Backbone:
């Protein structure tokens, strides 16, 4: 359970993300795909992209970055009371898109890296720990729905 102080740190940096959702979404998906190439293979939409330059030029990848960060932002602004928003996301990522929990750990590392790079004055170590905790809470609760459905592994 995050404290109110930890939520404030998370949502303070998140409001900075919201000034450039698309740019962040690009940088986070590119870092995920470069750091963990197995993740790119899960997207038939993107698996043609073979260089970072082709990634950065793809408008469809930039669109999907916005989709991902808009969904994450709506879950973070619920401060933990996010059951309605996670149900459908866990259901599609377990049963349709076939994404292991560990790749949600990987995209959480890429989100934390990109926020540190873009917002270092609002993303010191207090806020990095709080955002770590918020992304762990997201993973914990998606993993419980995976397990329900027979996909925790
Ligand atoms: C912060 C974590 C994530 C969030 C909030 C998120 C959110 C979303 C949303 C909102 C959609 C479209 C609606 C849906 O299908 O449920 C989607 C689609 C999808 N996601 Fe995620 N996602 C996340 C992580 C990942 C990861 C780590 C992968 C792959 C490694 C992944 C793979 C996919 C795929 C393959 C689609 C379908 C894309 C398409 O072909 O249009 N997701 N995601």
Residues:
């Amino acid at each position: 359970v995050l404290s109110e102080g930890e939520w404030q740190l998370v949502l303070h940096v998140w409001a900075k993300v919201e000034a450039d959702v698309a740019g962040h979404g690009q940088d986070i998906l590119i870092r995920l795909f470069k750091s963990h190439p197995e993740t790119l293979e899960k997207f038939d939409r993107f698996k043609h992209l073979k260089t970072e330059a082709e990634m950065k030029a793809s408008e469809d990848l930039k669109k999907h970055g916005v989709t991902v960060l808009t969904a994450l932002g709506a879950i973070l602004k619920k401060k933990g009371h996010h059951e309605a928003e996670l149900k459908p996301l866990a259901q599609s990522h377990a049963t349709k898109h076939k994404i292991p929990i560990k790749y949600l750990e990987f995209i959480s590392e890429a989100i934390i890296h990109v926020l540190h790079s873009r917002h270092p004055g609002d993303f010191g170590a207090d806020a990095q720990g709080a955002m770590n905790k918020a992304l762990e809470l997201f993973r914990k609760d998606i993993a419980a729905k995976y397990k329900e459905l027979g996909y925790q592994g």
